[PDB]
Design an enzyme around this catalytic site. Sequence first.
Site, short mmCIF file in Angstrom:
data_model
loop_
_atom_site.label_atom_id
_atom_site.label_comp_id
_atom_site.label_asym_id
_atom_site.label_seq_id
_atom_site.Cartn_x
_atom_site.Cartn_y
_atom_site.Cartn_z
N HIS A 61 56.86 31.01 8.24
CA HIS A 61 57.06 29.96 9.22
C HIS A 61 56.19 28.76 8.92
O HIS A 61 56.67 27.62 8.96
CB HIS A 61 56.77 30.50 10.65
CG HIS A 61 57.53 31.75 10.96
ND1 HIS A 61 58.91 31.78 11.05
CD2 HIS A 61 57.11 33.02 11.19
CE1 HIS A 61 59.30 33.01 11.35
NE2 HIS A 61 58.23 33.78 11.43
N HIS A 91 46.85 26.13 11.23
CA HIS A 91 48.10 25.93 10.52
C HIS A 91 48.63 24.55 10.91
O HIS A 91 48.08 23.88 11.78
CB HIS A 91 49.12 27.02 10.87
CG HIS A 91 49.46 27.00 12.33
ND1 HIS A 91 48.71 27.68 13.26
CD2 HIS A 91 50.38 26.29 13.03
CE1 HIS A 91 49.18 27.40 14.48
NE2 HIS A 91 50.19 26.55 14.37
N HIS A 93 52.44 22.05 11.39
CA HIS A 93 53.88 21.87 11.52
C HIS A 93 54.18 20.51 10.90
O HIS A 93 53.43 19.56 11.08
CB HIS A 93 54.32 21.88 13.00
CG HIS A 93 53.85 23.10 13.75
ND1 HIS A 93 54.66 24.17 13.98
CD2 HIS A 93 52.65 23.43 14.28
CE1 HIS A 93 53.99 25.11 14.63
NE2 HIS A 93 52.75 24.69 14.82
N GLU A 103 54.85 18.35 16.82
CA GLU A 103 55.39 19.09 17.95
C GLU A 103 55.18 18.29 19.23
O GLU A 103 56.14 17.89 19.90
CB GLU A 103 54.75 20.48 18.00
CG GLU A 103 55.06 21.28 16.75
CD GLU A 103 55.07 22.76 17.02
OE1 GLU A 103 54.01 23.28 17.45
OE2 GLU A 103 56.11 23.40 16.78
N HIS A 116 47.11 22.57 14.10
CA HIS A 116 46.73 23.42 15.22
C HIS A 116 45.58 24.31 14.80
O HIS A 116 45.74 25.18 13.94
CB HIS A 116 47.91 24.28 15.67
CG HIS A 116 48.97 23.49 16.33
ND1 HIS A 116 50.26 23.94 16.49
CD2 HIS A 116 48.91 22.24 16.86
CE1 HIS A 116 50.95 22.98 17.10
NE2 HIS A 116 50.15 21.95 17.34
N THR A 195 53.77 27.60 20.62
CA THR A 195 54.98 26.84 20.28
C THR A 195 55.93 27.61 19.36
O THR A 195 56.98 27.08 18.99
CB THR A 195 54.65 25.49 19.64
OG1 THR A 195 54.09 25.75 18.36
CG2 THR A 195 53.72 24.65 20.50
N1 LIG Z 1 51.77 26.90 17.15
S1 LIG Z 1 50.63 27.46 18.13
O1 LIG Z 1 51.05 27.29 19.50
O2 LIG Z 1 49.36 26.88 17.76
C1 LIG Z 1 50.48 29.20 17.87
C2 LIG Z 1 49.22 29.76 17.71
C3 LIG Z 1 49.10 31.14 17.53
C4 LIG Z 1 50.22 31.93 17.52
C5 LIG Z 1 51.47 31.37 17.68
C6 LIG Z 1 51.61 30.00 17.86
ZN LIG Z 2 51.21 25.61 15.81
#
Ligand SMILES: NS(=O)(=O)c1ccccc1
Ligand SMILES: [Zn+2]
Length: 257
Positions: A61, A91, A93, A103, A116, A195
């Site tokens: 992902h 990570h 996006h 996002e 994030h 998200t």
């Molecule tokens: N993309 S996010 O909201 O930061 C996220 C963080 C941890 C697990 C799944 C999603």
């Molecule tokens: Zn994220």
Amino acid sequence: HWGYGKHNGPEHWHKDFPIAKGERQSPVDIDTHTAKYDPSLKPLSVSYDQATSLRILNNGHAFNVEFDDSQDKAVLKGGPLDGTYRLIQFHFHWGSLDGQGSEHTVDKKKYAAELHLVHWNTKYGDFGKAVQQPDGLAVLGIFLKVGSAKPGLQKVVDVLDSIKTKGKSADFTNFDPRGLLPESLDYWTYPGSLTTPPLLECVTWIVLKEPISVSSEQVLKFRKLNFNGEGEPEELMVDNWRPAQPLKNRQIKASFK
Ligand SMILES: NS(=O)(=O)c1ccccc1
Ligand SMILES: [Zn+2]
Ligand SMILES: OC[C@H]1O[C@@H](O)[C@H](O)[C@@H](O)[C@@H]1O
Ligand SMILES: OC[C@H]1O[C@H](O)[C@H](O)[C@@H](O)[C@@H]1O
Ligand SMILES: NS(=O)(=O)c1ccccc1
């Protein structure tokens, strides 16, 4: 299984994850005119000096840079937060083009990408227990725009060739996440969710107002990653963002007057 394609993307997620239509889903559009300064917010503290990065993983992902969270090292405190939140991973996006990829949006404007930094509330002992709690997580979100290169991002960029496909990982020790921050810690905050599936409504979002600048070459290397595994047909890892969700019964607060 869930993804970002036409047949398994955000518009399908509610069939397996009905909370996708819930009351505090993320991301959201940040209407900067409606957001209100909140004098009750305490100073925000991003304390990353002792961070211990371990590994970078292509999970099909995005890619996650993982940290040792077995003790208070890299932590987030203050601002809207009650207590101490420990960094577990970061990570991004991003988009197929520079005009999309974030996002959260700011007055409907989409950035090229969004970072994030994910933290869990230490009062709950482990990430898994934290995601059973309304205040289990805090995610520090940082927008990326394309301009000058971000020196502190280059080590990430340069390892991506070694984790091209889903399920690949590489050592990623001695990485300093302080190099990913902008100068200012001015932010917006609101209660929301993960998200990505499972879309759990556990997150205090803290979204920095100042973007970081990254170079075109840096983001182009994000776009060479693959959603697929080794030996499978190539599907470029691009447009791995969820669009803005309904604000419903929420207010966005600003840290700055
Ligand atoms: N993309 S996010 O909201 O930061 C996220 C963080 C941890 C697990 C799944 C999603
Ligand atoms: Zn994220
Ligand atoms: O009742 C007045 C209150 O309304 C709330 O919706 C706002 O968040 C507060 O800042 C305001 O003081
Ligand atoms: O800091 C993260 C990584 O950056 C570079 O890839 C270094 O060569 C490697 O030793 C380190 O683990
Ligand atoms: N939520 S999901 O895994 O994307 C999904 C996709 C298609 C049908 C049912 C569920």
